[PDB]
């Protein structure tokens, strides 16, 4: 009989399972008692996986990892790393998302503080929209998705095979593309996102499924440790292979966001749930990136010299064109977006690395600017213009923070972090990327993404002179609390992104334990 | 390598008609003439599976994406139309050309990557169809990729939700029924009984046709609001 | 090859037949021109008027469109039980439990969909 | 007939699929289209399959099916609520994102 | 052992399996022709009628007679149609259903010119799917005769055509399951050699209902009837048809009834086995007169279906997908995880636990299965309200 470590699969198989329980609670619960189960049984299984990483984690203080489900599964020191970011993250988004309306003299606050409309499939101002929010309805059906997706996602980075990561691909991907159209205001735009998301992410993935095919034409099997040693071997084809890496590259650059990919990120961000927008902005970068991580420095290293320029090419653009178009952004969401773009050509610098060097600064630097980002979106979410609907207008912005000093400082604290800063975890994690580029050879690079972080710092900076240097304007935005929850998503990820600023070296020892994948 | 000679033909037959079927996807300006074209696209690819030694994987094709592109042409008629021909004039300035020349310049490259393969060895696949190939297909997924399979449950239930969550009207937007509609105040009844029939004249007696008043004007009841008014 | 030029072959008598079939069809018995005899049948009265034809049933909604989607997903997971079956005493008692938790999860599903009013409207 | 014509289709098909996906407005078709390009990686795997001697490629296509069959579910129920709100399912008039 | 058998099958000459081929597709014919006029003369009688009883002897040339008057008659194009597909549709429709046949096992191996063949034109690894998928493409024929008339009527057929799809089609996967559990093969050949010991109808008896009653379903047949559904859509889908392309539909009605008649007979009545008051005879099982017994079975499947029509009204075809959604395919789906559980127990030893899983599950089926058809179609309910107009006093 196959051998099944359910040890190492436990934290997966604990987010999986919550997902489906979770659906249980959707088909036999009572409506009044179907939130208070969901959260409670979402939170609380996601503390279990987080749980269950630690565990794991000290399992494999001994062996370096081991494959699990007779290979197409592997937990080793940066899957495990990527598994802990991604359920920490997790834990920070389903609070985000599990966020109920301040107070209303009705007791129908309906999961809208986060934003999610009622009843999705009402039309947008319809009558039935009105009655379904006045009801105080929710559909709690965003928990047991939410769970799928980071359940894919924890799946991602671990995924040993080409099959098992395209299934990962698209279990993380289809949650997300229902999540993006949910959003409770502006739901057209929601609506616009959900669909260029879901087009876009079918388009790239079928390009990833079709590189798998190319590299297992190749090289003659599925599992990654297997591709590598055919390449390696020279067994394989070596044309086949280059394209299918180029193929598959394309679905994960779409999933990263690299500017030939990028343009569904700017939409998709601003027009998602603000909630699902940043716990997506951190989640799926981390996992896609471990995924790339893992294709790169286990699959077919030995290529380096044919997929290495390409990569160039690539972070170069992500880290102009992803900061430039931001210079002229007058959209919050939407400079963040392009923001994460550029974040996203910084992390591809440290990837292009090709050293373990690279593979700790890049664990390190997606659990930071994970951090970093979703509790950028999280405050975004707070302001309210005075019909409800979130103030992501920058002009709007103006003298915020002189309104409401503790948010100004902890979304300026972000901001920061984002232009990598000094004393931010931002600054830290750029530090580790650019220096594991300089030691692969890519200075370059290292020159081309200090020029991009100068430009980038422009618009970065003048959200803060908006914020604290100019007079608020007469209909300036307000602040909603709206619950202890969304408070705590903040407060935690701002002292993470600061903590990480200034005493790094914690969770830098454990990036560079993980700088070595099994391969 | 070189296939059998009958192996080549079905593949040049099937294989045309697949590349025909795809094209016609494309570029049917009707719908459900795309719908079709899926279908036979579909079909042909699942022949070509079953010639190449693939036969439960031809014939799952056959019966699953038969049930699928059935359903693509329920929602076609759903949503785009019956018979509605569309324009497909490129509305975006330069969008067609720019995307004819991406598309023929990825397959170019993709072909000239692929190159000569099969001239490094094409081993028969009769040795892993010895003993079943289902048992051999069982036999791998049960064991090598278990984890995928499961995770395929997860695919479905994401399916359902979010086609619960997007597209299942709830309470609020039920609609009445017979029995409801039956009842209001008094249903139809009082309100024009049944509404007066469509005029019928000489020459004259579909729906379209309003009916005559006694002063010889048309009887707006008499005609359904949707129908332009005409005949 | 073989095993399939039977059906090859059976295919294309079946093919002849209904392609020869439809051109008897054409070509045997009389034919008649007549504006009326071509037109749409609409239970004797006229047709409405096709110049008018893009106002009305332009597009049919279909009130099972969600049992619709969800047949999509359902008839491609089932396939997976049929290599299981054949399979079924080859693979073991960890193949069968494997299933019985895959099937499971359908079924939990299928209970989600069913309970909250999915199969209801057609 | 040499085997690799067998992965040339398969680019063709894909490409087409692609193509598709650039050219034509309709939600629906541009499902369709994606089904293309997923079967043309099926046809791949398929073709590789045979090439090896083992039966990975076909599971691999097996599951490309399922995927392709739950992302085109899903992006009907997407289409349904667009169509719902906006009474077209044409991809262009979801246009309100830009710049 | 391995099925289809390799030293049974794929070694037919060109001439004898083009001859093989040809025998099927004759008895075909004339099964359809048999059909067409047996059903009219037992619904006679169902009905204290005679049935077809002038046209040539005793009627026997009524069927012919019909299809050669389909012949002579005038083929219309409606203008409006979508021509292509209008004219491809019957096609469309007739060509699966031959070729879903081609895997059907008529008997066992036979001596024919010096050549022992099996007395069927193929058997495939696959052979049961490939019957499915052939008679899946198979509904796209109605489908687009429907679509393609360019009427309300036709339209409205080929929509309740794919609904019945849906309903069905699912519904016969399942039921396909326990079978290739009990024989191990999807190969048609490999399923009759399972029944050997005992036909699956007894063992599976819930899938053999199951499989039934989405047959019933699939050959647009009463009391489904949907696509066509004369008292509610004329004609249904075959409306603007007239001429060979009508009597090609109707063909591949008759067809699919006998190809899932025949698949019946193949999964759960033992194929072409002899029954039990002719299983004792020696030879029974050999020779020819297996075609006798497939024959026999496939036409008491075919009595079935006349009996359903005399029967029974047709349903709403959002009542046929409720059924098929909320019973048959709940109710297969859990009976494979109950055939799965029981046979691996008693693999295991467990037989008392097998058999008392067995029977509570069906118990509680047969429980569930009166619960929904009782209580969730609740033969009670509420009162009503008086209105404007005036009301007299109730008694």
Same mark, same amino acid.
């Given at each position: 009989?196959?051998?099944?470590?359910?040890?190492?699969?436990?934290?997966?198989?604990?987010?999986?399972?919550?997902?489906?329980?979770?659906?249980?609670?959707?088909?036999?619960?009572?409506?009044?008692?179907?939130?208070?189960?969901?959260?409670?049984?979402?939170?609380?299984?996601?503390?279990?996986?987080?749980?269950?990483?630690?565990?794991?984690?000290?399992?494999?203080?001994?062996?370096?990892?081991?494959?699990?489900?007779?290979?197409?599964?592997?937990?080793?020191?940066?899957?495990?790393?990527?598994?802990?970011?991604?359920?920490?993250?997790?834990?920070?988004?389903?609070?985000?998302?599990?966020?109920?309306?301040?107070?209303?003299?009705?007791?129908?606050?309906?999961?809208?503080?986060?934003?999610?409309?009622?009843?999705?499939?009402?039309?947008?101002?319809?009558?039935?929209?009105?009655?379904?929010?006045?009801?105080?309805?929710?559909?709690?059906?965003?928990?047991?998705?939410?769970?799928?997706?980071?359940?894919?996602?924890?799946?991602?980075?671990?995924?040993?095979?080409?099959?098992?990561?395209?299934?990962?691909?698209?279990?993380?991907?289809?949650?997300?593309?229902?999540?993006?159209?949910?959003?409770?205001?502006?739901?057209?735009?929601?609506?616009?996102?959900?669909?260029?998301?879901?087009?876009?992410?079918?388009?790239?993935?079928?390009?990833?499924?079709?590189?798998?095919?190319?590299?297992?034409?190749?090289?003659?099997?599925?599992?990654?440790?297997?591709?590598?040693?055919?390449?390696?071997?020279?067994?394989?084809?070596?044309?086949?292979?280059?394209?299918?890496?180029?193929?598959?590259?394309?679905?994960?650059?779409?999933?990263?966001?690299?500017?030939?990919?990028?343009?569904?990120?700017?939409?998709?961000?601003?027009?998602?749930?603000?909630?699902?927008?940043?716990?997506?902005?951190?989640?799926?970068?981390?996992?896609?990136?471990?995924?790339?991580?893992?294709?790169?420095?286990?699959?077919?290293?030995?290529?380096?010299?044919?997929?290495?320029?390409?990569?160039?090419?690539?972070?170069?653009?992500?880290?102009?064109?992803?900061?430039?178009?931001?210079?002229?952004?007058?959209?919050?969401?939407?400079?963040?977006?392009?923001?994460?773009?550029?974040?996203?050509?910084?992390?591809?610098?440290?990837?292009?690395?090709?050293?373990?060097?690279?593979?700790?600064?890049?664990?390190?630097?997606?659990?930071?600017?994970?951090?970093?980002?979703?509790?950028?979106?999280?405050?975004?979410?707070?302001?309210?213009?005075?019909?409800?609907?979130?103030?992501?207008?920058?002009?709007?912005?103006?003298?915020?923070?002189?309104?409401?000093?503790?948010?100004?400082?902890?979304?300026?604290?972000?901001?920061?972090?984002?232009?990598?800063?000094?004393?931010?975890?931002?600054?830290?994690?750029?530090?580790?990327?650019?220096?594991?580029?300089?030691?692969?050879?890519?200075?370059?690079?290292?020159?081309?993404?200090?020029?991009?972080?100068?430009?980038?710092?422009?618009?970065?900076?003048?959200?803060?002179?908006?914020?604290?240097?100019?007079?608020?304007?007469?209909?300036?935005?307000?602040?909603?609390?709206?619950?202890?929850?969304?408070?705590?998503?903040?407060?935690?990820?701002?002292?993470?992104?600061?903590?990480?600023?200034?005493?790094?070296?914690?969770?830098?020892?454990?990036?560079?334990?993980?700088?070595?994948?099994?391969? | 390598?070189?296939?059998?000679?009958?192996?080549?033909?079905?593949?040049?037959?099937?294989?045309?008609?697949?590349?025909?079927?795809?094209?016609?996807?494309?570029?049917?300006?009707?719908?459900?003439?795309?719908?079709?074209?899926?279908?036979?696209?579909?079909?042909?690819?699942?022949?070509?599976?079953?010639?190449?030694?693939?036969?439960?994987?031809?014939?799952?094709?056959?019966?699953?994406?038969?049930?699928?592109?059935?359903?693509?042409?329920?929602?076609?008629?759903?949503?785009?139309?019956?018979?509605?021909?569309?324009?497909?004039?490129?509305?975006?300035?330069?969008?067609?050309?720019?995307?004819?020349?991406?598309?023929?310049?990825?397959?170019?490259?993709?072909?000239?990557?692929?190159?000569?393969?099969?001239?490094?060895?094409?081993?028969?696949?009769?040795?892993?169809?010895?003993?079943?190939?289902?048992?051999?297909?069982?036999?791998?997924?049960?064991?090598?990729?278990?984890?995928?399979?499961?995770?395929?449950?997860?695919?479905?239930?994401?399916?359902?939700?979010?086609?619960?969550?997007?597209?299942?009207?709830?309470?609020?937007?039920?609609?009445?029924?017979?029995?409801?509609?039956?009842?209001?105040?008094?249903?139809?009844?009082?309100?024009?009984?049944?509404?007066?029939?469509?005029?019928?004249?000489?020459?004259?007696?579909?729906?379209?046709?309003?009916?005559?008043?006694?002063?010889?004007?048309?009887?707006?009841?008499?005609?359904?609001?949707?129908?332009?008014?005409?005949? | 090859?073989?095993?399939?030029?039977?059906?090859?072959?059976?295919?294309?008598?079946?093919?002849?037949?209904?392609?020869?079939?439809?051109?008897?069809?054409?070509?045997?018995?009389?034919?008649?021109?007549?504006?009326?005899?071509?037109?749409?049948?609409?239970?004797?009265?006229?047709?409405?008027?096709?110049?008018?034809?893009?106002?009305?049933?332009?597009?049919?909604?279909?009130?099972?469109?969600?049992?619709?989607?969800?047949?999509?997903?359902?008839?491609?997971?089932?396939?997976?039980?049929?290599?299981?079956?054949?399979?079924?005493?080859?693979?073991?008692?960890?193949?069968?439990?494997?299933?019985?938790?895959?099937?499971?999860?359908?079924?939990?599903?299928?209970?989600?969909?069913?309970?909250?009013?999915?199969?209801?409207?057609? | 007939?040499?085997?690799?014509?067998?992965?040339?289709?398969?680019?063709?098909?894909?490409?087409?699929?692609?193509?598709?996906?650039?050219?034509?407005?309709?939600?629906?078709?541009?499902?369709?289209?994606?089904?293309?390009?997923?079967?043309?990686?099926?046809?791949?795997?398929?073709?590789?399959?045979?090439?090896?001697?083992?039966?990975?490629?076909?599971?691999?296509?097996?599951?490309?099916?399922?995927?392709?069959?739950?992302?085109?579910?899903?992006?009907?129920?997407?289409?349904?609520?667009?169509?719902?709100?906006?009474?077209?399912?044409?991809?262009?008039?979801?246009?309100?994102?830009?710049? | 052992?391995?099925?289809?058998?390799?030293?049974?099958?794929?070694?037919?000459?060109?001439?004898?399996?083009?001859?093989?081929?040809?025998?099927?597709? @004759?008895?075909?014919?004339?099964?359809?022709?048999?059909?067409?006029?047996?059903?009219?003369?037992?619904?006679?009688?169902?009905?204290?009628?005679?049935?077809?009883?002038?046209?040539?002897?005793?009627?026997?040339?009524?069927?012919?007679?019909?299809?050669?008057?389909?012949?002579?008659?005038?083929?219309?194009?409606?203008?409006?149609?979508?021509?292509?597909?209008?004219?491809?549709?019957?096609?469309?429709?007739?060509?699966?259903?031959?070729?879903?046949?081609?895997?059907?096992?008529?008997?066992?191996?036979?001596?024919?010119?010096?050549?022992?063949?099996?007395?069927?034109?193929?058997?495939?690894?696959?052979?049961?799917?490939?019957?499915?998928?052939?008679?899946?493409?198979?509904?796209?024929?109605?489908?687009?005769?429907?679509?393609?008339?360019?009427?309300?009527?036709?339209?409205?057929?080929?929509?309740?055509?794919?609904?019945?799809? @849906?309903?069905?089609?699912?519904?016969?996967?399942?039921?396909?399951?326990?079978?290739?559990?009990?024989?191990?093969?999807?190969?048609?050949?490999?399923?009759?050699?399972?029944?050997?010991?005992?036909?699956?109808?007894?063992?599976?008896?819930?899938?053999?209902?199951?499989?039934?009653?989405?047959?019933?379903?699939?050959?647009?047949?009463?009391?489904?009837?949907?696509?066509?559904?004369?008292?509610?859509?004329?004609?249904?889908?075959?409306?603007?048809?007239?001429?060979?392309?009508?009597?090609?539909?109707?063909?591949?009605?008759?067809?699919?009834?006998?190809?899932?008649?025949?698949?019946?007979?193949?999964?759960?009545?033992?194929?072409?086995?002899?029954?039990?008051?002719?299983?004792?005879?020696?030879?029974?099982?050999?020779?020819?007169?297996?075609?006798?017994?497939?024959?026999?079975?496939?036409?008491?499947?075919?009595?079935?279906?006349?009996?359903?029509?005399?029967?029974?009204?047709?349903?709403?075809?959002?009542?046929?997908?409720?059924?098929?959604?909320?019973?048959?395919?709940?109710?297969?789906?859990?009976?494979?995880?109950?055939?799965?559980?029981?046979?691996?127990?008693?693999?295991?030893?467990?037989?008392?636990?097998?058999?008392?899983?067995?029977?509570?599950?069906?118990?509680?089926? @047969?429980?569930?299965?009166?619960?929904?058809?009782?209580?969730?179609?609740?033969?009670?309910?509420?009162?009503?309200?008086?209105?404007?107009?005036?009301?007299?006093? @109730?008694?």
């Amino acid at each position: 009989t196959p051998s099944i470590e359910y040890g190492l699969l436990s934290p997966m198989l604990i987010v999986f399972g919550v997902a489906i329980a979770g659906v249980l609670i959707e088909a036999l619960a009572p409506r009044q008692s179907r939130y208070p189960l969901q959260v409670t049984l979402a939170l609380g299984g996601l503390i279990a996986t987080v749980v269950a990483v630690v565990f794991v984690a000290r399992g494999l203080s001994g062996t370096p990892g081991r494959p699990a489900v007779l290979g197409a599964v592997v937990l080793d020191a940066p899957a495990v790393f990527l598994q802990g970011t991604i359920a920490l993250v997790g834990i920070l988004g389903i609070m985000l998302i599990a966020e109920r309306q301040k107070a209303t003299v009705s007791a129908g606050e309906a999961r809208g503080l986060e934003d999610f409309t009622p009843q999705a499939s009402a039309v947008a101002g319809s009558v039935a929209e009105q009655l379904a929010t006045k009801t105080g309805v929710m559909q709690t059906e965003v928990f047991p998705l939410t769970m799928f997706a980071i359940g894919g996602m924890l799946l991602f980075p671990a995924a040993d095979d080409l099959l098992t990561m395209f299934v990962a691909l698209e279990v993380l991907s289809l949650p997300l593309y229902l999540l993006c159209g949910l959003a409770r205001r502006r739901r057209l735009l929601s609506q616009e996102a959900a669909l260029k998301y879901f087009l876009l992410g079918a388009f790239s993935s079928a390009f990833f499924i079709y590189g798998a095919a190319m590299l297992y034409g190749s090289a003659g099997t599925l599992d990654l440790s297997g591709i590598a040693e055919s390449v390696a071997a020279g067994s394989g084809n070596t044309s086949l292979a280059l394209l299918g890496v180029a193929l598959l590259l394309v679905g994960v650059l779409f999933k990263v966001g690299a500017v030939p990919f990028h343009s569904w990120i700017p939409d998709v961000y601003q027009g998602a749930p603000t909630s699902i927008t940043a716990f997506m902005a951190a989640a799926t970068k981390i996992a896609a990136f471990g995924a790339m991580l893992r294709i790169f420095y286990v699959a077919v290293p030995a290529l380096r010299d044919d997929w290495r320029p390409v990569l160039w090419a690539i972070a170069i653009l992500t880290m102009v064109v992803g900061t430039v178009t931001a210079v002229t952004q007058t959209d919050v969401k939407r400079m963040l977006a392009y923001s994460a773009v550029a974040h996203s050509g910084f992390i591809l610098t440290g990837v292009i690395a090709a050293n373990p060097a690279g593979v700790s600064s890049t664990l390190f630097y997606l659990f930071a600017y994970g951090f970093s980002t979703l509790g950028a979106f999280a405050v975004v979410g707070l302001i309210r213009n005075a019909a409800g609907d979130e103030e992501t207008s920058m002009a709007q912005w103006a003298g915020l923070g002189r309104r409401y000093p503790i948010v100004g400082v902890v979304f300026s604290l972000f901001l920061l972090a984002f232009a990598g800063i000094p004393l931010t975890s931002g600054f830290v994690s750029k530090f580790a990327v650019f220096k594991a580029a300089g030691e692969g050879g890519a200075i370059p690079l290292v020159i081309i993404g200090v020029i991009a972080s100068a430009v980038a710092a422009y618009f970065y900076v003048r959200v803060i002179v908006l914020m604290f240097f100019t007079e608020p304007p007469d209909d300036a935005p307000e602040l909603v609390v709206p619950s202890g929850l969304s408070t705590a998503v903040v407060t935690v990820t701002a002292a993470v992104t600061f903590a990480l600023g200034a005493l790094p070296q914690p969770l830098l020892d454990l990036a560079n334990s993980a700088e070595t994948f099994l391969h | 390598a070189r296939t059998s000679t009958s192996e080549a033909v079905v593949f040049w037959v099937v294989g045309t008609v697949a590349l025909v079927g795809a094209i016609g996807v494309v570029a049917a300006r009707k719908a459900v003439y795309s719908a079709v074209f899926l279908a036979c696209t579909m079909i042909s690819l699942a022949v070509l599976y079953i010639a190449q030694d693939a036969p439960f994987l031809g014939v799952v094709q056959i019966v699953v994406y038969t049930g699928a592109v059935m359903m693509l042409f329920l929602f076609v008629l759903m949503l785009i139309g019956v018979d509605l021909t569309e324009s497909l004039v490129e509305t975006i300035k330069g969008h067609r050309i720019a995307a004819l020349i991406a598309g023929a310049g990825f397959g170019i490259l993709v072909i000239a990557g692929i190159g000569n393969v099969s001239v490094a060895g094409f081993s028969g696949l009769a040795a892993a169809n010895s003993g079943g190939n289902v048992e051999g297909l069982a036999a791998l997924i049960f064991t090598r990729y278990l984890w995928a399979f499961e995770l395929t449950s997860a695919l479905l239930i994401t399916a359902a939700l979010g086609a619960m969550v997007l597209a299942h009207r709830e309470r609020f937007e039920r609609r009445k029924t017979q029995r409801e509609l039956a009842i209001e105040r008094f249903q139809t009844g009082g309100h024009p009984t049944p509404l007066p029939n469509p005029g019928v004249y000489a020459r004259h007696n579909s729906v379209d046709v309003p009916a005559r008043l006694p002063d010889g004007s048309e009887s707006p009841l008499s005609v359904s609001t949707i129908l332009p008014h005409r005949t | 090859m073989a095993l399939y030029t039977p059906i090859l072959i059976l295919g294309a008598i079946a093919a002849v037949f209904a392609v020869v079939s439809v051109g008897i069809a054409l070509v045997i018995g009389p034919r008649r021109f007549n504006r009326s005899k071509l037109e749409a049948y609409e239970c004797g009265i006229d047709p409405l008027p096709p110049v008018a034809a893009g106002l009305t049933g332009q597009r049919i909604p279909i009130r099972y469109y969600l049992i619709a989607m969800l047949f999509i997903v359902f008839d491609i997971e089932i396939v997976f039980l049929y290599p299981w079956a054949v399979a079924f005493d080859s693979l073991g008692l960890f193949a069968v439990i494997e299933m019985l938790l895959f099937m499971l999860t359908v079924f939990v599903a299928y209970a989600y969909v069913w309970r909250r009013g999915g199969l209801n409207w057609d | 007939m040499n085997p690799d014509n067998y992965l040339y289709l398969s680019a063709l098909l894909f490409t087409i699929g692609a193509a598709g996906v650039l050219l034509r407005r309709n939600a629906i078709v541009m499902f369709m289209c994606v089904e293309l390009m997923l079967n043309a990686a099926n046809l791949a795997f398929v073709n590789f399959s045979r090439m090896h001697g083992q039966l990975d490629g076909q599971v691999v296509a097996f599951f490309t099916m399922v995927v392709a069959a739950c992302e085109v579910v899903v992006g009907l129920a997407i289409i349904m609520a667009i169509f719902r709100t906006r009474r077209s399912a044409s991809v262009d008039d979801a246009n309100l994102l830009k710049h | 052992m391995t099925h289809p058998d390799p030293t049974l099958f794929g070694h037919d000459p060109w001439w004898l399996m083009l001859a093989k081929a040809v025998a099927i597709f @004759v008895f075909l014919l004339l099964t359809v022709l048999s059909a067409i006029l047996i059903e009219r003369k037992l619904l006679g009688r169902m009905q204290m009628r005679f049935g077809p009883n002038r046209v040539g002897p005793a009627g026997l040339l009524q069927s012919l007679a019909d299809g050669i008057k389909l012949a002579l008659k005038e083929g219309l194009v409606p203008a409006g149609v979508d021509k292509p597909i209008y004219l491809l549709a019957p096609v469309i429709s007739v060509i699966p259903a031959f070729v879903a046949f081609s895997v059907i096992p008529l008997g066992g191996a036979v001596s024919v010119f010096g050549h022992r063949t099996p007395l069927q034109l193929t058997d495939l690894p696959v052979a049961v799917l490939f019957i499915l998928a052939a008679t899946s493409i198979g509904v796209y024929g109605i489908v687009l005769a429907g679509w393609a008339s360019g009427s309300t009527y036709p339209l409205l057929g080929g929509l309740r055509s794919s609904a019945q799809v @849906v309903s069905y089609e699912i519904a016969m996967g399942l039921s396909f399951v326990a079978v290739f559990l009990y024989a191990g093969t999807m190969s048609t050949s490999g399923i009759v050699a399972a029944q050997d010991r005992t036909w699956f109808v007894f063992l599976l008896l819930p899938s053999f209902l199951v499989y039934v009653v989405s047959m019933v379903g699939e050959t647009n047949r009463a009391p489904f009837d949907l696509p066509e559904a004369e008292g509610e859509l004329v004609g249904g889908f075959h409306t603007e048809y007239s001429s060979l392309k009508f009597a090609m539909f109707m063909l591949a009605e008759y067809v699919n009834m006998t190809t899932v008649s025949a698949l019946a007979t193949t999964m759960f009545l033992g194929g072409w086995h002899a029954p039990f008051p002719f299983n004792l005879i020696d030879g029974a099982n050999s020779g020819w007169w297996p075609l006798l017994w497939f024959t026999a079975k496939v036409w008491t499947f075919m009595f079935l279906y006349f009996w359903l029509r005399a029967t029974l009204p047709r349903l709403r075809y959002d009542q046929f997908m409720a059924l098929g959604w909320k019973v048959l395919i709940p109710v297969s789906l859990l009976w494979i995880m109950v055939v799965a559980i029981t046979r691996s127990l008693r693999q295991h030893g467990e037989g008392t636990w097998a058999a008392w899983l067995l029977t509570a599950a069906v118990v509680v089926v @047969v429980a569930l299965i009166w619960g929904l058809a009782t209580s969730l179609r609740r033969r009670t309910v509420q009162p009503p309200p008086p209105q404007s107009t005036g009301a007299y006093p @109730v008694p």
